[PDB]
Amino acid sequence: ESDTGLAPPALWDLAADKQTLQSEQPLQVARCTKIINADSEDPKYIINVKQFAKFVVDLSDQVAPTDIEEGMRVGVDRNKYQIHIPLPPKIDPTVTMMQVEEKPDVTYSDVGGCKEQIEKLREVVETPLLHPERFVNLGIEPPKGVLLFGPPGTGKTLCARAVANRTDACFIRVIGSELVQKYVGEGARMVRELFEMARTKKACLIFFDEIDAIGGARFDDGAGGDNEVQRTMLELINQLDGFDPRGNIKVLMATNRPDTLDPALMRPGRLDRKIEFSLPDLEGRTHIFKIHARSMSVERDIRFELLARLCPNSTGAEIRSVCTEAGMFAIRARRKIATEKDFLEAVNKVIKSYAK
């Protein structure tokens, strides 16, 4: 037997007598296409199928020539190919899914040693939100966007969260690969949707994480058949200026690669201040050891300076990896606490396998 979409008759039995006949002859059938361009004061819209041809047709009198832009899935007649009511991609709540507005479990002391950039992030974020007085009286426009760049996992996510719980109001994190979509012209609508619905509420913070994917990478040198990252990039630099007459909401980007750099972003009005992160000297390392040991069972008679001396060049993900590995050494035997020599092997296991 088969199914073919059946059900027992108690819900569709009354549906199947005369409602099916009214969904055939009155209800028409339309198709979807893409919109290449447009003309002024007259439609003359050019529409491609990508499978049939490119057609030059007109809209119907059901819609107004207002929201029909380049790149929108619209309804196409079978006979006259006329533009019916366009269709949106996705509805509705795609902003709340990245705007949790929730108190994060990060202590302000979780970043110790490189306090100079944290005070820079204090001045750039907190002071035009709550102390906007010296900016007016002297005569410098306050900056409203800072790029972060440097070695990966240096504390980029840590410092970006350190300002997140600092004011606790409208934190928005954007994944860099989430805007890499499949449809033609998908993120640029979402960038319009994010920017409008964040300007409604005040004291809001938006963070762009991993802008190596969409934030001005290669502008258009490898994608010569799709052109989506560039159109979104051209749209976001378009909507950032012009549509920001003296706003309040701050936008921050971070990258690993110090190459994906737009000079049009460093035009004054988009991005002005350079803040990079560097490696800890001695103490910022040892602080992270003091962070990733207090949560686990270690010996109270061991030191952390000696371990950081064995690690000249190291990041917090590496330091976290040593503690997990030295964690596993204590599990290899029947030890319910951590001894110093398990940390010493984990240094030699992590470093002296591939690094140096």
């Binding site: 199914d3 059946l6 549906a15």
Partner: protein
């Protein structure tokens, strides 16, 4: 004579039903579908179609007049999530392999210990590792070791070859990743074993054509659902290739995989077991001397040993016998093993 309303709807629809493709679902009794030629239609959907199983990626039934959704269609016998599950038992448990006991406690503490004794982790609050990489020279012990650990377990096991994830329907790739990880989540904490992951992940190149992007999105969604961080339920994943340097670096970096097990070289110790293992299921006569074959040749694997025993069986059947004499082994040792013997600095290093 009683069944009437179902019979009318069996007769209400059009007879030449075509087969469609769900793309997006809008809950206003109409949506957008796809034909077989990639032509897409703003059509509607009926009421009897049982709107509970409509997923973007499912197959439906369409018409010729208005091409509306006649009824939802099943998977049409597509066993791409059920066949890869090992139902029976694999090969011998731990006595099959030999001379790899350096590497046994690694995988035993990583798989069996988080399941059988999850108390060592809770005495100090330390998380178990998620992924384990098995690389080394090709055909060394990698497939033989994975079957050795999967035999000694008390949970379900998955066998994935890697080429049975790659299709061309533009959704089938990352969907079956979600369909497998849903099966692994809903069922017992299975052991994901995806062999040959170098075919899907290397060096992260993006082209403009539509032959390569179906790999990268499936790779990217795999790293997304591996690190979905919502509810994984301790699913242990074992990944293995031969080479390691031409692989994806962000799968190597911690947070993802913290176990990179290497499978080094041999010796004339581990061989003698594999000679005995391969010469067990045959009519081994009482006139054969394997010890002369062991000491003489000094570089061979078990796949070489297997090729010896098969050629020994063939030479015995060419001379119309049942049992095998030593001479068939001697010629098989001299015939088959002469295909790769090249390159040695002899008499130079004591």
């Amino acid at each position: 004579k009683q069944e009437e309303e179902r019979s009318k709807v069996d007769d209400l629809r059009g007879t030449p039903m075509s087969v469609g493709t769900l793309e997006e679902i809008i809950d206003d009794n109409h949506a957008i579908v796809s034909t077989s030629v990639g032509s897409e239609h703003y059509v509607s959907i009926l009421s009897f179609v049982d709107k509970d199983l409509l997923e973007p990626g499912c197959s439906v039934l369409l018409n010729h007049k208005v091409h509306a959704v006649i009824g939802v269609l099943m998977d049409d016998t597509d066993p791409l999530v059920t066949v890869m599950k090992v139902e029976k038992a694999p090969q011998e448990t731990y006595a099959d392999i030999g001379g790899l006991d350096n590497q046994i406690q690694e995988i035993k503490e990583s798989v069996e210990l988080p399941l059988t004794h999850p108390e060592y982790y809770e005495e100090m609050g330390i998380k178990p590792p998620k992924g384990v990489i098995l690389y080394g020279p090709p055909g060394t012990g990698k497939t033989l070791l994975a079957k050795a650990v999967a035999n000694q377990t008390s949970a379900t096991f998955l066998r994935v070859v890697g080429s049975e994830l790659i299709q061309k329907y533009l959704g089938d790739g990352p969907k079956l990743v979600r369909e497998l990880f849903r099966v692994a989540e809903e069922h017992a904490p299975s052991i994901v074993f995806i062999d040959e992951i170098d075919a899907i992940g290397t060096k992260r190149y993006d082209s403009n054509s539509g032959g390569e992007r179906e790999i990268q999105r499936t790779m990217l969604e795999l790293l997304n659902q591996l690190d979905g961080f919502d509810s994984r339920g301790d699913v242990k994943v074992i990944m293995a290739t031969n080479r390691i340097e031409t692989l994806d670096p962000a799968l190597i970096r911690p947070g993802r995989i913290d176990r990179k097990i290497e499978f080094p070289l041999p010796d004339e110790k581990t061989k003698k077991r594999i000679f005995q293992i391969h010469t067990s299921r045959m009519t081994l006569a009482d006139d054969v001397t394997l010890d002369d074959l062991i000491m003489a040749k000094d570089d061979l694997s078990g796949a070489d040993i297997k090729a010896i025993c098969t050629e020994a069986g063939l030479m015995a059947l060419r001379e119309r016998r049942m049992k095998v004499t030593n001479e068939d082994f001697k010629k098989s040792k001299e015939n088959v093993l002469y295909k790769k013997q090249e390159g040695t600095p002899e008499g130079l290093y004591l």
